[PDB]
Design a protein around this ligand. Structure first.
Ligand SMILES: COc1cc(CN2CCOc3c(cc(Cn4ccn(C)c4=N)cc3-c3ccc(F)cc3C)C2=O)cc(OC)c1
Ligand SMILES: COc1cc(CN2CCOc3c(cc(Cn4ccn(C)c4=N)cc3-c3ccc(F)cc3C)C2=O)cc(OC)c1
Lengths: 310, 301
């Protein structure tokens, strides 16, 4: 008979795999767009690739001279970009494991990176207080944005690549026009903004501040629509995610070693995932299935894969 | 060059799908069907949201109000219905047509609805009162499409009679006829308001400057000899023309080169309807009764 919409009140994420192999803190985990792989970066100077579904170690990618803060996938899942304390980014062929380009220009640690949807560009944020825009094909820096007055905590492209959002310890989030490099909007109280990214519809940004607060902003109207709290975040730049494959949740790590999951709309906590033995610095949501990756700092050094029915 | 790839297949209709339209706020997709139902789906995730019901026979067409809060539907039951999308309730039934209602649209301001019917008329309705304001004796055969200009001052209509006409909304008087005349199966204004895209049942789409009554571009390679197939301007990425086709593919042309930049394969019947998301490179397509599904396709460019 009739067709209906499931409206789960909570997910039921359960631990399936614990991925060991990094020898220092894990800094970042990201699922490939095609859903097949997980990439991890670490202070141990390595990238590791794992099967997204079974956790199975696939390969180690090496070449950076110091720790890696961040990794990101190209849209076609064939390339990775990495951000390192060696002041460089590296573009990698995931198949061969080899470095295609080294992106030189930042004058201090590179903290965050992302490809645009077309994946002809990379954006980076650095302790040097700048955001750079790079040409994937040549590896040359196209633009340097004097974006902030303190380290840049996150950079993210919107769904057509026309906008970049940046955050910083200076307390600001800024929206930039990719084409011109000009600021379009500043969101300014000002605790350190530890993380930012665009919503899947392009209309909102989710932003973490080091006052134990996540906020969903409509940035055209500069109005905070939703606030998520109850977790611990006063020190680290912790990634946060929209989970969109089942119920609509907000996911973040926490300094109390748990993964927090909130109902996006009600703003209530629906689950806390226990298992890590250090700060959960990074979380990622699988693009088509209800799968969370989480990763922790050096007391733990593991990645965990959690699966839900909704 | 686009790289549309299949992301979602939306099943639920039990007969042919007739029409798919994205809400102006970008959040929803509405579908109409021969099964007498409207279905709402999330534009980004394909997720079934709700079913809206009340028509006594099949539905040919649906359209959104500018504020995304209302739908209007055109039915073989000879009525249009205005719906509150939130509640799913019918607010008004628009009675007047003496045969199937084939096509409908709100004006940009969404105080008016325009309709086209097998009765060969175009009607202009008052959204707030539901009364028929004007009946245009527009055509000498079923009306295939009706569409308001960017400012609501004009209406374009097409018909199997082979004519495309532009009407003055305020007076209901014809302003121009573009007339060597295969059935005109679809027509709509460009986002600019300057041009008109028209389909004819000779496997041809044509872009017309209607101020200069000259055909500027011609798009072929698709099959269209039988059905009234929607066509679109895609303006979120590159400038493309999108249309369904009787060979079960979605065609995308470079507007200027008139070259087939892509063909989207997946449907197992005539692709009767396509829509382009208002702010993202997302295509909705929908097919007839061998298929009965809607598909959502996404590109980066
Ligand atoms: C003024 O003082 C500060 C202090 C900080 C604190 N801080 C830096 C220490 O190390 C971190 C931190 C967060 C991450 C997670 N991460 C990575 C990219 N993104 C978007 C993100 N959220 C990873 C590392 C890290 C880096 C290199 C490694 F080799 C190893 C690890 C584990 C973190 O919280 C940051 C800041 O400016 C950003 C300034
Ligand atoms: C003289 O003979 C004719 C023959 C036709 C052929 N024809 C009618 C049969 O059904 C169709 C057709 C096209 C569409 C798509 N569509 C919807 C509105 N618009 C702007 C548009 N292009 C939808 C339906 C339909 C209607 C009701 C349903 F319950 C179910 C479906 C699937 C179609 O091609 C048409 C014509 O004049 C209009 C005259």
């Amino acid at each position: 008979g009739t067709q209906s919409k499931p409206t789960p009140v909570k997910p039921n994420y359960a631990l399936k795999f614990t991925l060991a192999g990094h020898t220092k803190a894990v800094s970042s985990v990201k699922f490939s767009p095609n859903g097949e792989w997980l990439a991890s970066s670490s202070a141990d100077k390595l990238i590791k690739i794992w099967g997204a579904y079974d956790g199975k170690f696939e390969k180690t990618i090496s070449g950076h001279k110091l720790g890696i803060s961040d990794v990101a996938w190209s849209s076609d899942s064939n390339l990775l970009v990495s951000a390192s304390d060696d002041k460089t980014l590296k573009i990698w062929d995931v198949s061969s494991g080899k470095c295609l380009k080294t992106l030189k220009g930042h004058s201090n640690y590179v903290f965050c990176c992302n490809f645009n949807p077309q994946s002809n560009l990379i954006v980076s944020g650095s302790f040097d207080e700048s955001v750079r825009i790079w040409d994937v094909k040549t590896g040359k820096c196209l633009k340097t944005l004097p974006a902030h007055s303190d380290p840049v905590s996150a950079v993210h492209f919107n769904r057509d690549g026309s906008l970049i959002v940046s955050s910083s310890y200076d307390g600001l989030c800024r929206i930039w026009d990719t084409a011109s490099g000009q600021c379009l909007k500043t969101l300014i109280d000002n605790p350190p903004v530890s993380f930012v990214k665009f919503s899947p519809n392009g209309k909102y940004i989710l932003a973490a501040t080091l006052d134990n607060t996540l906020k969903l902003w409509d940035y055209s109207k500069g109005k905070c629509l939703k606030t998520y709290t109850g977790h611990k975040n006063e020190k680290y730049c912790i990634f946060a995610n929209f989970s969109v494959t089942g119920g609509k949740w907000i996911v973040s790590g926490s300094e109390d070693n748990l993964v927090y999951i909130w109902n996006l709309q009600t703003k209530e906590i629906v689950q806390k995932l226990q298992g890590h033995t250090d700060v959960v610095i990074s979380t990622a949501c699988h693009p088509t299935e209800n799968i969370i990756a989480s990763a922790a700092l050096e007391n733990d050094k593991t990645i965990k894969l959690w699966k839900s029915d909704c």
